[PDB]
Write a protein that binds this ligand. Structure first.
Ligand SMILES: NC(=[NH2+])c1ccc(N)cc1
Ligand SMILES: [Ca+2]
Length: 223
C-alpha cells in the first residue's frame, strides 16, 4: 500500500496473509474455513495466516492453518486478468473472535463514489521497494467505469473496477494482491492489478466480487 497509514494491530480482522515460507499475497476470510483471494496468487503449499499484524513477529493473536484445497475461478484468464478470483479452503476451521473474523459478501454491487478500505503488507513505494512488517491501510473511492476504461483503454472488463486517486500517490501495490477492498462492511473488491503503483492516471484495478457471489456460495456448498 502506497500513501496509506498503519491500520493498527488486528483492526482489519478478516485480512489474511498467504504464506509459502514468506508472505506473498493477501486474502479475506469469508467464513471459518474459506478465504477469497486473487487467482494470480495461486500456488501449491499455501499456509493461511490469520490474526496477523507484524508478519515477521509472533505477537499472540495469530492462527496459522494450512490450506486443504484451492479453487481458481473456472474462467480465469491470466493474460487479461479477467476473473481474478480464487477460493482457498482451510484444513481446519479458524477460531473466530474479535481479532479474527469473517467479512460478509455483498448483497449488492457497490457504486462509483463509495468509499472503501484497502489493506495489505505490499510495497509502500511507487519508486523502488520497501515492504512494511505491519498491516497498511488506505481509504479510497470506487471510480466511475468511464474513468476506469479511459485510464486503461481496452483492458477493463465487466468483472473489474477501478478505485483510488487519478492524481496518484495513493494505491495498492505488489504484495497487496489478493487482499480486500471493503465498502460499508462488505467485501466488494480484490486487489488485482495496475500500472506500477500510485502513478498518475493509473488507478488500482480490482476484481468485482459482487459478480461472483453465486459462484462463491455454490463452490463452498459442495467443497
Ligand atoms: N493497484 C496497483 N497499482 C497494483 C496492485 C497489485 C499489483 N500486483 C500491481 C499493481
Ligand atoms: Ca505476527
Amino acid at each position: 500500500i502506497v500513501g496509506g497509514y498503519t491500520c493498527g494491530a488486528n483492526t482489519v480482522p478478516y485480512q489474511v496473509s498467504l504464506n509459502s515460507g514468506y508472505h506473498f499475497c493477501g486474502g479475506s476470510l469469508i467464513n471459518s474455513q474459506w478465504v477469497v483471494s486473487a487467482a494470480h496468487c495461486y500456488k501449491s503449499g499455501i499456509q493461511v495466516r490469520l490474526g496477523e499484524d507484524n508478519i515477521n513477529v509472533v505477537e499472540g493473536n495469530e492462527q496459522f492453518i494450512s490450506a486443504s484445497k484451492s479453487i481458481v475461478h473456472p474462467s480465469y484468464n491470466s493474460n487479461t486478468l479477467n476473473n481474478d478470483i480464487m477460493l482457498i479452503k482451510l484444513k481446519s476451521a479458524a477460531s473466530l473472535n474479535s481479532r479474527v473474523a469473517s467479512i460478509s459478501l455483498p448483497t449488492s454491487c457497490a457504486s462509483a463514489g463509495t468509499q472503501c478500505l484497502i489493506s495489505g503488507w505490499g510495497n509502500t513505494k511507487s519508486s523502488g521497494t520497501s515492504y512494511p512488517d505491519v498491516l497498511k491501510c488506505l481509504k479510497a473511492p470506487i471510480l466511475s467505469d468511464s474513468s476506469c476504461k479511459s485510464a486503461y483503454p481496452g483492458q477493463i472488463t465487466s468483472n473489474m473496477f477501478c478505485a483510488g486517486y487519478l492524481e496518484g500517490g495513493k494505491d495498492s501495490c505488489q504484495g497487496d494482491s489478493g487482499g480486500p477492498v471493503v465498502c460499508s462492511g462488505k467485501l466488494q473488491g480484490i486487489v488485482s492489478w495496475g500500472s506500477g503503483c500510485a502513478q498518475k492516471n493509473k488507478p488500482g484495478v480490482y476484481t468485482k466480487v459482487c459478480n461472483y457471489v453465486s459462484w462463491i456460495k455454490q463452490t463452498i456448498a459442495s467443497n
